[PDB]
Structure formats: structure tokens, C-alpha cells
Design a protein around this ligand. Sequence first.
Ligand SMILES: Cc1cc2nc3c(=O)[nH]c(=O)nc-3n(C[C@H](O)[C@H](O)[C@H](O)COP(=O)(O)OP(=O)(O)OC[C@H]3O[C@@H](n4cnc5c(N)ncnc54)[C@H](O)[C@@H]3O)c2cc1C
Ligand SMILES: NC(=O)c1ccc[n+]([C@@H]2O[C@H](COP(=O)([O-])OP(=O)(O)OC[C@H]3O[C@@H](n4cnc5c(N)ncnc54)[C@H](O)[C@@H]3O)[C@@H](O)[C@H]2O)c1
Length: 432
Amino acid sequence: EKHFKYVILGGGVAAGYAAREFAKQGVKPGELAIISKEAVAPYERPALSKGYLFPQNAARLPGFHVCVGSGGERLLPEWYSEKGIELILSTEIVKADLASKTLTSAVGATFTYEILIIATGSSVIKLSDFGTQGADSNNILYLREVDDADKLVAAIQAKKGGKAVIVGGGYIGLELSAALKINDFDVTMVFPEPWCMPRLFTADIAAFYESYYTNKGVKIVKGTVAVGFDADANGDVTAVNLKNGSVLEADIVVVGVGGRPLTTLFKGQVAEEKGGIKTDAFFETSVPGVYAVGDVATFPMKMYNELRRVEHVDHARKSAEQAVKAIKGKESGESVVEYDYLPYFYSRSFDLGWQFYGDNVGDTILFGDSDPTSAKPKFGSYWIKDGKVLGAFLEGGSPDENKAIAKVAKTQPPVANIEELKKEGLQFASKI
Ligand SMILES: Cc1cc2nc3c(=O)[nH]c(=O)nc-3n(C[C@H](O)[C@H](O)[C@H](O)COP(=O)(O)OP(=O)(O)OC[C@H]3O[C@@H](n4cnc5c(N)ncnc54)[C@H](O)[C@@H]3O)c2cc1C
Ligand SMILES: NC(=O)c1ccc[n+]([C@@H]2O[C@H](COP(=O)([O-])OP(=O)(O)OC[C@H]3O[C@@H](n4cnc5c(N)ncnc54)[C@H](O)[C@@H]3O)[C@@H](O)[C@H]2O)c1
């Protein structure tokens, strides 16, 4: 039975960035523990679907421990022990009782706390959820944690030069389709929607990336779903059966069909909304002394005057920081300001890299070029509602251009002339 003044439950992005903030805020040896079911210290999860899969110069632990993903210092296991912050690894909590402030591990150990930070992130929706036949065949893989990534690297090696089917057209789908093609697989991506990345992309943006990918040799099958998987006598996947009637041969299948916030330990004990744990502007739940951050939190997004849940990395880092600031502020008598987040999303495919800021609401225009067979692609999009820019996307931007579009999203400037916005889209951003 161990007690700590502060317990972070989960050892991911938000956990690590919260530890770093606790350090900055003066935490003392013996005050803080992090409990994680993973066997390693907090790391930059984004590396797992990018640099981890590169066929050379790949990312590997301990290189991508937090906080190197945002250009900060690296927090190795030794940083935590030198600060007297205890890492309790390979420990999965299976029961949380918020009244008695007690956590229980699968093996029966118990942990009590005074303040709890719920940083349990998301799990992955699985094809067993859809009732897809044969979905338990071997070499049908999902990607969330570094153990998953290691299985994937192992399959990439064992099936070298084979066929991969990627089930899903979101973030995992785009990144993994690219990764498998770069590792010399024949790759087909399958999804039900009419264009990829429906959670952000417009039809116009999606067409650029889908043409890019098919020019690289990736096949895309839209408007269908998997209905079953053939397997061999060892139970290893051999083929994906589609609802449209097509059967795709496959040595590896990777699935990216959505994440789910891991809130199940807390059902009934805290207020929920939009699938996550409802919080205030300081990441406090409906239970005092219990905070939720990162992917599990539904919080007030001040600039859009709405409750939202964000399932991306920038928010996991900044929410973690805000929570610790609020906790420390409450212990002194000190005021903290309400979280004021600008959504920042990004991804990379092959030699492409885009950034998006703000809100994808209103009607869209493109600017730049747009031609996927251009020497060096560089184009963007503005989302315009009520005469003002609410969202901005840019592929191929310099650091100054990226900062400029972020300033557009943050300040929501009015648009006088649309044709002058489309010719000179970034001149507009730079004048803001
Ligand atoms: C492969 C991959 C690539 C990504 N890349 C990007 C990207 O490029 N850009 C971007 O904006 N976003 C990206 N994301 C999303 C981003 O990483 C998440 O928003 C971020 O990790 C959320 O941080 P978190 O702390 O809330 O959760 P997570 O980092 O998932 O951390 C949750 C932690 O809690 C542990 N946990 C859960 N339940 C328990 C329990 N019961 N007991 C003990 N431990 C538990 C988990 O094992 C894990 O350590 C990506 C996600 C994935 C999966
Ligand atoms: N660059 C990034 O921001 C980035 C990269 C990797 C992962 N992630 C995160 O990791 C989590 C997992 O990503 P994800 O791509 O699984 O989810 P996502 O929410 O980004 O995409 C879900 C996708 O599942 C597909 N889908 C739904 N039903 C399906 C079906 N029946 N059959 C085939 N496809 C179906 C859709 O094409 C949809 O695009 C999310 O939180 C995501 O934000 C983010």
C-alpha cells in the first residue's frame, strides 16, 4: 500500500508533460507518482506511426521520451528518480474508488492519493466491435502503444515485400498507408466514406492527398467496409473480404477505425459528456481534487464557447500543464487563468507535411498549388464563416508561414475580397 500526495494515472503524453510542469512548479521528492500499464517512461506517442516505422534511421526508445516532441528536454527514467518522482510501471489499474481515493492494480496492489490526475488517454476501436468475421486472425494489428509498434515492426520484417491492407481512412490510415509503402509493401487502404480524413479534410484537400498516394502506388477503395478475413491453418490472415464483393490478398492488415477515451474506471463516479469526463477550464472534474486531461477530457474551449473533447498531441501537452498550474494555484491562494486553447492538428505523409489551426467551419477556399505533381507542393485552405476566417490549413509551409496561419485562426480576421484571398493566401496571413 503506497500513498502519494499527487497521483497521475497513465504514463503517456499528458503524464510526462504534467511531470515536467510539477518539476517547474517545485514538486518535492516523495510527493508524485505516475502509474502506467506500459513498461517504459512517458514518450512522444506520435513517433509510433512515423519515425518508429522508418526502414532506416528509425526512432527508438529512449530517444523519443517526452518532452523532445515539442523541442523540450528529454525526461529519461533517471530524471524521475533524481526528482524523486516515482514511476510505477507495468501496473494496470482495474478499479478506482474516488470516495476512498484508492486505486487497485490487476495484481491487487493499492495506491491512495490526495490529488488524482486522470491521464488514461484512448484505446482503439477494434474490428470485433463491428462483428467482422475472422477479425482475431494473426497479423491483423492495431497501433496505440510502443508494444504495438514493436509487433508491427516485427511483421514488417517477417512479411518484407508482401501485401498490406490498411482498414480505415483517418489519421492512422493515412500515416500507416505511407509507412507500409515506404517499407516496400503493396498497400491498399479501405474505408466507407467518400474521401479520406472526414474528421478534418474537405473534399478538395482530400483529393490532393488521395492523388498523391495513388501516384505513389497506394490503392484506395472507398465506399465499402471489410466483412471478413480469410486465414490459413496457422490462423494467420491471408485475405480481406469486402462488402463490395472484392477480396484483397494480405500478409498484414493494420486497422485504424477510431479511438475511444479510456473512462471506464470512472463510470458513475464523475460527470461525462461528449464521450469524456467533463471538466472545467482548469481540468477539474465534478469530483474535487480529481482532474482529467488529454484525450479523456471534455472541457470548455474558450474561443468557440463550447465544450469539446480533443484527441491530439498539442492539447495533451498543454492540458497537462494547465491542470498542474491549477492544482498548484489552488494550494497557494494564487489565481490561474482559464485554459485558452487554439486547435493545432498536423500530419505527414511521404515528403509532405501539413498544419491546421482553428476550426473547420464555414465554406472553404484553396490557395497556392494544389497540383499533386508539382515540384514542391505548397497550398492551403481557409474556412470562412460570416465574413471572417475561422480555420486555416497549409501544406509545405515555412515556420513563418505556419505561424502566420495560426495567427489568422487565432484572430479571425474579416475577408474583404475573396479573389485577392485566393491569389496571395499567405500574403494575407502575413499582413495579419
Ligand atoms: C500512434 C499514434 C500517433 C499519433 N500521432 C499524433 C500526431 O502526429 N499529432 C497529434 O496531434 N496527435 C497524434 N496522436 C494522438 C496523440 O498521441 C494523443 O492525443 C495523445 O497521446 C494523448 O495523450 P494522453 O496522455 O491523453 O494519452 P496517451 O498518451 O494515450 O497516454 C495514456 C496512458 O495511460 C495508460 N493507461 C490507460 N489506462 C490505464 C490504466 N487503467 N492503468 C494504468 N495505465 C493506464 C496507457 O498505457 C498510456 O500510458 C497520435 C496517436 C497515436 C496513437
Ligand atoms: N497526426 C495525428 O493527429 C494523428 C496520427 C495518428 C493517430 N492519431 C490519433 O490516434 C487516434 C486513432 O486514429 P484513427 O485514425 O483510428 O481515428 P480517426 O478518428 O482519425 O479516424 C477514424 C477513421 O475510421 C474510418 N472508419 C470508420 N468506420 C470504418 C469502418 N467500418 N471500416 C473502415 N474504416 C472505418 C474512417 O475512415 C475514419 O476516417 C485518434 O485519436 C487520432 O486523433 C492522430
